[PDB]
């Protein structure tokens, strides 16, 4: 037992996350970098009062009310369009550890691109969701789907409550329920489409939703589609969580003061940006104190946390029977496509009836079901459950390694996602080109998907990354962080 | 996303030094006088804080709220509309300090009273909280 601090949140292990506040001198220089950039945008759009070539709205028989706001497209053409060479690069291989990248360039200053012919090979990637290393066209794991592909085909032309319902679908929905250790489970077509089609089938008009500051575009969208009051609490702030949670019961609606119909909470396991784990036992202890429900999102967390990785519940060692509904995907540890919902059998049956997607959308393709099954078989017991001990070794090694190198890292230390802090917007545009010169492709995260002084880069660790693959990348970063002086930390 | 843009870290510190640069730029002009430097810098500041707060409406990016604040200028949309916040009051105190130093300089003249007041007038008038959404015959 480690911490039982105030809310009854019982901790087994030390927690050890790190949110180092940004330095004073660093932050001021950022606004200057945007300030010069917002200056030329008004300059550039003023120059466009006569005629880098544009999409040119049809003149032929048109010119109604214009389609777009000119001003809402400001940042996409004056900060994005300048440096959009990165995070869009086509690859032409299996996204494993080394990735063949088609080379492209623009003499029109990123306004129109061009492939030369080039295939930049053996590029170490750190920007793919390939945690347990199942992206390979080799081995017996993917080979089993080839038997399924030559037999079944590549997609039902039907719906789940309609004709299309294969035995594999019935098999997989069983298989995850034993994997999660819950009663029943149900797979969906893609992980985005799960939250945007099932959360509106749960909450209704008189409900209240307590979601985090930074969930996803999934979880917000499902909360918009269900007409329901949405309230935001601060990120991993149980005190700010309980403060809303207190006032949610001792008040009701704003207009009437009737009680709420039901309330629930939308939280994720591992937040993708600023890779951090939610203070989960302080949430389980608090929802029992206030009779709220809980929607949990193991999109990143499953296959990455716990021994023989089974999401954050085994990582906190807790029970699956206190989380009211569990959701995760198959794209981000399994090398597949789609997502599930785990929950009680009463819940699943209600969602086998009121689904928005089992009744309208077509279901999974048959061979990618097999890729999910054989991957879970290698986990449940052949590149199997030894790689999660490898990745946690790779996580814990790489996390201390950049921290002692003077870089600044967010999130919990055991989190495989490595948020690396840039601050200047030019340092965004240089860094993606700079690492690509040093035979490594990474993911940089721009301004509007962050706050202003975050503008970070992000690393996805992998169990497929060995030590020599990892240390070679450590050598390349040591030069670049020197070259751009991005050694912001004091320690 | 324009609701936490003045609620950020060190934006207050950087807002000063932009004006502090703008004065030292305006201080090193040959055919100018040390009163009308202060007269100039109180006019330009209150010109910027009208055009960048009370004229342009919407976001430079695209809002996932389906354009709720498309008809709302930047002052109206700070902190999701709650007026008496920690950062709007900083934005109201600062032109007054820029009014009093330009009161101190130019030696309290009559034309430097007239020209430097209506700039300070026309910037605080929209910052009345009971003038939240009323727009005078336009915009």
């Amino acid at each position: 037992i480690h911490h039982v601090t105030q809310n009854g949140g019982l901790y087994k292990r030390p927690f050890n996350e790190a949110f180092e506040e940004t330095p004073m001198l660093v932050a001021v220089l950022t606004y200057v970098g945007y300030g010069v950039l917002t200056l030329f945008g008004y300059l550039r759009d003023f120059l466009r009062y006569w005629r880098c070539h544009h999409a040119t709205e049809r003149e032929e028989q048109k010119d109604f009310v214009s389609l777009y706001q000119d001003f809402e497209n400001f940042y996409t053409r004056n900060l994005y369009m300048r440096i959009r060479d990165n995070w869009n690069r086509p690859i032409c291989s299996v996204p494993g550890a080394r990735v063949d990248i088609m080379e492209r360039q623009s003499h029109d200053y990123n306004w129109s691109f061009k492939y030369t012919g080039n295939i930049i090979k053996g590029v170490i990637n750190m920007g793919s969701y390939n945690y347990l290393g199942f992206a390979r066209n080799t081995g017996s794991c993917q080979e089993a789907a080839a038997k399924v592909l030559e037999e079944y085909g590549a997609g039902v032309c039907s719906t789940r409550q309609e004709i299309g319902n294969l035995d594999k679908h019935e098999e997989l929905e069983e298989l995850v329920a034993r994997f999660l250790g819950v009663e029943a489970a149900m797979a969906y077509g893609m992980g985005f489409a799960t939250n945007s089609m099932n959360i509106p089938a749960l909450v209704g008009k008189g409900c209240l939703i307590l979601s985090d500051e930074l969930n996803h575009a999934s979880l917000v969208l499902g909360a918009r589609l269900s007409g329901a009051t949405i309230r935001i609490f601060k990120h991993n702030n149980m005190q700010s969580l309980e403060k809303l949670l207190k006032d949610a019961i001792v008040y009701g609606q704003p207009r009437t003061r009737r009680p709420w119909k039901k309330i629930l909470i939308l939280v994720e396991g591992i937040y993708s940006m600023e890779g951090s784990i939610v203070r989960l036992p302080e949430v389980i202890a608090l929802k029992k104190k206030y009779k709220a429900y809980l929607y949990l999102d193991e999109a990143h967390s499953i296959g990455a946390l716990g021994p023989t990785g089974r999401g954050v519940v085994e990582y906190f060692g807790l029970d699956p029977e206190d989380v009211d509904v569990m959701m995760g995907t198959f794209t981000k540890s399994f090398g597949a496509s789609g997502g599930y919902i785990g929950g009680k059998k009463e819940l699943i049956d209600y969602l086998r009836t009121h689904s928005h997607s089992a009744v309208y959308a077509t279901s999974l393709s048959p061979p990618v079901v097999e890729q999910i099954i054989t991957s879970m078989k290698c986990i449940m017991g052949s590149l199997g459950k030894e790689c999660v001990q490898q990745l946690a070794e790779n996580t814990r090694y790489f996390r201390r390694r950049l921290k002692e190198m003077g870089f600044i890292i967010y999130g919990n230390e055991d989190s495989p996602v490595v948020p690396l802090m840039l601050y200047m917007p030019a340092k965004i545009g240089a860094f993606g080109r700079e690492m690509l010169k040093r035979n490594i492709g990474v993911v940089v995260v721009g301004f509007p998907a962050t706050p202003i002084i975050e503008s970070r880069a992000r690393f996805c660790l992998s169990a497929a990354h060995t030590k020599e693959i990892l240390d070679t990348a450590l050598k390349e970063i040591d030069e670049v962080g020197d070259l751009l002086q991005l050694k912001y930390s004091r320690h | 996303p324009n609701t936490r843009v003045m609620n950020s870290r060190g934006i207050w510190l950087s807002y000063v030094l932009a004006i502090g640069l703008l004065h030292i730029v305006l201080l090193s002009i040959p055919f100018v006088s040390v009163p009308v430097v202060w007269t100039l810098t109180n006019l330009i500041h209150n010109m910027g804080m009208y055009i960048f707060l009370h004229t342009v409406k919407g976001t430079p990016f695209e809002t996932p709220d389906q354009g709720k604040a498309r008809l709302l200028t930047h002052w109206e949309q700070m902190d999701y509309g709650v007026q008496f916040t920690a950062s709007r009051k900083f934005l109201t105190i600062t032109p007054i300090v820029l009014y009093f130093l330009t009161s101190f300089y130019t030696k309290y003249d009559q034309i430097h009273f007239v020209l430097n007041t209506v700039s300070l007038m026309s910037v605080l008038i929209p910052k009345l909280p009971q003038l939240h959404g009323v727009r005078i015959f336009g915009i």
Binding site: R255 | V82, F84, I96, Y108, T117
Partner: peptide
């Protein structure tokens, strides 16, 4: 020095404006 005529009248309005302005603390069938 020590007085402009109708200006320390107007300046006294502004310095008294801040004191009300400093303590309001909040805002908005």
């Amino acid at each position: 020095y020590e007085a402009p005529a109708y200006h320390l009248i107007l300046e006294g309005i502004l310095i008294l404006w801040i004191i009300r302005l400093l303590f309001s603390k909040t805002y908005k069938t």
